[PDB]
Amino acid sequence: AAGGLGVERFVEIGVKSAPTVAGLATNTLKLPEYSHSTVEVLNSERDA
Amino acid sequence: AHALVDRLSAGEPYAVAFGGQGSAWLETLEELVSSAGIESELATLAGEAELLLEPVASELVVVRPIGFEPLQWVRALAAEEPVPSDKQLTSAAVSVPGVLLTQIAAVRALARQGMDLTATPPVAVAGHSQGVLAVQALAAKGAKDVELLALAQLIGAAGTLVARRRGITVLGDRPPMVSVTNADPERIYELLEEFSSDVRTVLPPVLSIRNGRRSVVITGTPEQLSRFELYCTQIAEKEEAERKNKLRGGAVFAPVFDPVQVEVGFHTPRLSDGIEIVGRWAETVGLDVELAKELTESILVRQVDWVDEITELHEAGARWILDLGPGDILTRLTAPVIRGLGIGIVPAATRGGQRNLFTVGAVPEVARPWSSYAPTVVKLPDGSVKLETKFTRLTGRSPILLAGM
Amino acid sequence: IEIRFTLTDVVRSGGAPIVEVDDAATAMRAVLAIAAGVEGPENLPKVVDNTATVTVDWDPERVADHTGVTATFGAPLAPTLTVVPDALVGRCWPAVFAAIGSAATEAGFPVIEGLLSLVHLDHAARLLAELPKEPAEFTVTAKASAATDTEVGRVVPVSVEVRNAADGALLATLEERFAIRXXXXXXXXXXXXXXXXXXXXXXXXXXXXXXXXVTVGAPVDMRPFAVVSGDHNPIHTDRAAALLAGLEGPIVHGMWLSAAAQHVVTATDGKPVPPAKLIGWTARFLGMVKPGDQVDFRVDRVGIDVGAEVLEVSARIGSELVMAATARLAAPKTVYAF
């Protein structure tokens, strides 16, 4: 926000551990982050 | 034989209104040319548009080439093939002058048939946004006509150079101009002030137009406006959980939010660097009149408190208001504002409302003065006092009843 | 400004009743020199000697005009940067042209160049890892790497170095190659041969991925771009000069197209964040373009260089190929969590 809000990509690594903190981020991207931002949640396991 | 004008002379008074930007002007200008059988004015207006740009000693280096010959675009548009995109035509540089020309041509149309009658007399002439421009020289002599178009050419030009849209997204879609409905002017400014607390001095949103009681317009940078859009949505949703508890003080608000098609911020500090430049642009031309400085500030920076101005000329007891603005804008904005206070309003260049104008019998549209239905006192043979209403008059009794219980 | 010419008639040869003055080439130069530079910019290099651009400042309104000259919306495109790398060409233009003729052109070439016959081959901007920014001032240097002749004519590749004034470092490198069609030389000889590439140390390979289908209109008149870029060539403006050069009409500036297709690649595969993403772009002009032109562009994702995605662009007006473009783009910025 202080450095500009433009497109961000959030990638989790460690293979099968990847869905967790992404799902943690996903639900977090919902509740406070409702501002309608373009964000990409990517997982090493799932989204390779 | 125009009855209104004939009314205007002996009877009820009149006021001229001019619309602003966001009027969808081109299609009105295209029709106005096609509906015009008299091209006489357009000959001089086109030549003076060419002329006035050349002697200009003001900077105006970028503006003059990006200006376009009005006669060519019209004849092209009349061949039905050529015309630039709406995005190009809506840009302040070529749009602002074009809007005035539509309004000026709208003045001439009525002036063609009835001029001896359709000559001067308003009580006052008022305008909205850039509409205040065409107001001034209409109240001045006829040689000042292009000066409007001349200043309009300068207004949209500097405004464009200083600040222009750098981005847009199909969702909403997001402009510099935003409007919220149903919410108080105090409540809107609250959320505005709530959001403006979080942003820098360079891109604050501000209240531009107050269109009515609960209807307002806030403007600024498209991105920052989109941020204000977020808070109003969250409150709308949190209050939804309230309404479904079936409680009134605990009820959701049902506002209406949605952006506008306007391309650039007006009546905002973002145009502040434009005032100076515009001012010099007028003095280097034969446009010199002392209101060029005041018009610019009113249009570019100072807000427009609208309801209060046209109402002020209305509370003077002037019964009629016409609007020569493109399509027709501000003619209908003003109507529910005043409504039943005795004012009524015909859109000018609208064929239906002009049919009134040109006839002896179709003229007197005067909206109902609610005080007309104000209750009165009645006496009877046995000498009973009766309070008179539309109810009592029928029933012959007091305007009060015990409902079925 | 006026242009004069002279003829001479010897009728002893009937097949050659008219033979016209050999001073034409030098006479044409004096005419262009008055119009082009007006002695406004002045440095006096020979073609090999460096051509210097004194000082250059970027106003916020020069940002707007260019970004407004080329715009894209219908495809969800949002241009963002302080200075688009396309804006480099406006700064380096007046200097590059000065190298088109010289004593080295006098030695090995006839010095026969029609300016109307000038053809732009390729244009590219290579970054030194620095990107252009707000108010800091620029100073540009232009050098001619080689002067070549081809079967189709004379070619002059021009190297350009853009430097930030206040900081005093070289931000970017701009490359231009021009084609005059009438000349031959002992300087640099090419038949069909010229080649350029955007290369990087570490690379990854990918598969063809369709990104966007683009619709781009050409401007109504070419004068607006002519004012900003500083290209006054009558070919794109005056119809008499365009017809004299045997052209389809007042051809759209290839340079406008260059920023036209770029602005899309800027915003599309670049996404709402173009500024730090595109580190380079190259553009090849396949065919001429008339104003009022509906052109369809298509960018695809091909491969990866130095962690930056490469993006190939093809252009079609109906059946005709127009521009071949290729760009190096950084990926949408990634944040990692373990």
mmCIF file of N, CA, C and O in Angstrom, chain A residues 6-14 21 38 40, chain C residues 271-273 277 331-338:
data_model
loop_
_atom_site.group_PDB
_atom_site.id
_atom_site.type_symbol
_atom_site.label_atom_id
_atom_site.label_comp_id
_atom_site.label_asym_id
_atom_site.label_seq_id
_atom_site.Cartn_x
_atom_site.Cartn_y
_atom_site.Cartn_z
ATOM 1 N N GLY A 6 -0.087 -2.564 -7.067
ATOM 2 C CA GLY A 6 -0.188 -3.321 -8.308
ATOM 3 C C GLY A 6 0.113 -4.802 -8.169
ATOM 4 O O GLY A 6 0.688 -5.228 -7.168
ATOM 5 N N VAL A 7 -0.192 -5.554 -9.227
ATOM 6 C CA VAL A 7 -0.401 -7.005 -9.178
ATOM 7 C C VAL A 7 0.668 -7.760 -8.400
ATOM 8 O O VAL A 7 1.870 -7.525 -8.567
ATOM 9 N N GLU A 8 0.213 -8.661 -7.534
ATOM 10 C CA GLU A 8 1.112 -9.462 -6.719
ATOM 11 C C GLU A 8 0.818 -10.945 -6.934
ATOM 12 O O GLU A 8 -0.313 -11.319 -7.236
ATOM 13 N N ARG A 9 1.834 -11.788 -6.796
ATOM 14 C CA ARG A 9 1.642 -13.231 -6.915
ATOM 15 C C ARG A 9 2.164 -13.890 -5.647
ATOM 16 O O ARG A 9 3.301 -13.656 -5.248
ATOM 17 N N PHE A 10 1.331 -14.698 -5.005
ATOM 18 C CA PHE A 10 1.732 -15.358 -3.771
ATOM 19 C C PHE A 10 1.934 -16.848 -4.009
ATOM 20 O O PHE A 10 0.980 -17.581 -4.268
ATOM 21 N N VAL A 11 3.185 -17.288 -3.920
ATOM 22 C CA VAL A 11 3.532 -18.673 -4.212
ATOM 23 C C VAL A 11 4.043 -19.402 -2.974
ATOM 24 O O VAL A 11 4.904 -18.898 -2.253
ATOM 25 N N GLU A 12 3.496 -20.589 -2.731
ATOM 26 C CA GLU A 12 3.915 -21.413 -1.608
ATOM 27 C C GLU A 12 4.681 -22.632 -2.112
ATOM 28 O O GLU A 12 4.282 -23.265 -3.088
ATOM 29 N N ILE A 13 5.778 -22.956 -1.438
ATOM 30 C CA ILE A 13 6.693 -23.995 -1.904
ATOM 31 C C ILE A 13 6.869 -25.069 -0.831
ATOM 32 O O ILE A 13 6.487 -24.865 0.318
ATOM 33 N N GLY A 14 7.445 -26.210 -1.200
ATOM 34 C CA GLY A 14 7.489 -27.355 -0.308
ATOM 35 C C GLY A 14 6.521 -28.452 -0.703
ATOM 36 O O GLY A 14 6.226 -29.346 0.090
ATOM 37 N N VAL A 21 -0.775 -22.600 3.963
ATOM 38 C CA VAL A 21 -0.639 -21.167 4.249
ATOM 39 C C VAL A 21 -1.195 -20.305 3.110
ATOM 40 O O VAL A 21 -1.413 -19.101 3.265
ATOM 41 N N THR A 38 -6.365 -7.603 -7.576
ATOM 42 C CA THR A 38 -5.976 -8.704 -8.447
ATOM 43 C C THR A 38 -4.833 -9.367 -7.729
ATOM 44 O O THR A 38 -3.766 -8.776 -7.576
ATOM 45 N N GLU A 40 -2.893 -13.396 -7.034
ATOM 46 C CA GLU A 40 -2.817 -14.793 -7.432
ATOM 47 C C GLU A 40 -2.196 -15.666 -6.346
ATOM 48 O O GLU A 40 -1.052 -15.464 -5.937
ATOM 49 N N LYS C 271 0.194 -6.719 -17.825
ATOM 50 C CA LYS C 271 -0.818 -6.660 -16.770
ATOM 51 C C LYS C 271 -0.823 -5.246 -16.169
ATOM 52 O O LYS C 271 -0.037 -4.411 -16.608
ATOM 53 N N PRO C 272 -1.734 -4.945 -15.218
ATOM 54 C CA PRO C 272 -1.715 -3.611 -14.597
ATOM 55 C C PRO C 272 -0.336 -3.117 -14.122
ATOM 56 O O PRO C 272 -0.212 -1.933 -13.810
ATOM 57 N N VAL C 273 0.663 -3.996 -14.062
ATOM 58 C CA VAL C 273 2.033 -3.589 -13.759
ATOM 59 C C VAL C 273 3.002 -3.805 -14.937
ATOM 60 O O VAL C 273 3.673 -4.826 -15.016
ATOM 61 N N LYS C 277 8.503 -4.301 -15.497
ATOM 62 C CA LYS C 277 8.367 -5.597 -16.151
ATOM 63 C C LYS C 277 9.036 -5.688 -17.523
ATOM 64 O O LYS C 277 9.910 -6.531 -17.724
ATOM 65 N N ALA C 331 7.918 -11.391 -14.934
ATOM 66 C CA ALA C 331 6.663 -12.010 -14.527
ATOM 67 C C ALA C 331 5.959 -11.129 -13.499
ATOM 68 O O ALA C 331 6.591 -10.256 -12.902
ATOM 69 N N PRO C 332 4.643 -11.333 -13.306
ATOM 70 C CA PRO C 332 3.962 -10.654 -12.199
ATOM 71 C C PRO C 332 4.664 -10.982 -10.888
ATOM 72 O O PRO C 332 4.905 -12.155 -10.603
ATOM 73 N N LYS C 333 4.984 -9.952 -10.111
ATOM 74 C CA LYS C 333 5.883 -10.096 -8.966
ATOM 75 C C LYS C 333 5.418 -11.118 -7.935
ATOM 76 O O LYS C 333 4.256 -11.135 -7.530
ATOM 77 N N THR C 334 6.351 -11.970 -7.520
ATOM 78 C CA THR C 334 6.034 -13.121 -6.689
ATOM 79 C C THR C 334 6.486 -12.950 -5.241
ATOM 80 O O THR C 334 7.589 -12.472 -4.975
ATOM 81 N N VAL C 335 5.622 -13.344 -4.311
ATOM 82 C CA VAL C 335 5.952 -13.352 -2.891
ATOM 83 C C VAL C 335 5.906 -14.787 -2.372
ATOM 84 O O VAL C 335 4.889 -15.467 -2.500
ATOM 85 N N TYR C 336 7.008 -15.245 -1.787
ATOM 86 C CA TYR C 336 7.126 -16.643 -1.382
ATOM 87 C C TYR C 336 6.921 -16.867 0.115
ATOM 88 O O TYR C 336 7.302 -16.036 0.938
ATOM 89 N N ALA C 337 6.314 -17.999 0.454
ATOM 90 C CA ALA C 337 6.121 -18.387 1.846
ATOM 91 C C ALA C 337 6.381 -19.876 2.022
ATOM 92 O O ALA C 337 5.960 -20.689 1.198
ATOM 93 N N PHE C 338 7.073 -20.231 3.098
ATOM 94 C CA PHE C 338 7.423 -21.624 3.350
ATOM 95 C C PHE C 338 6.714 -22.172 4.586
ATOM 96 O O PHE C 338 6.977 -21.736 5.706
#
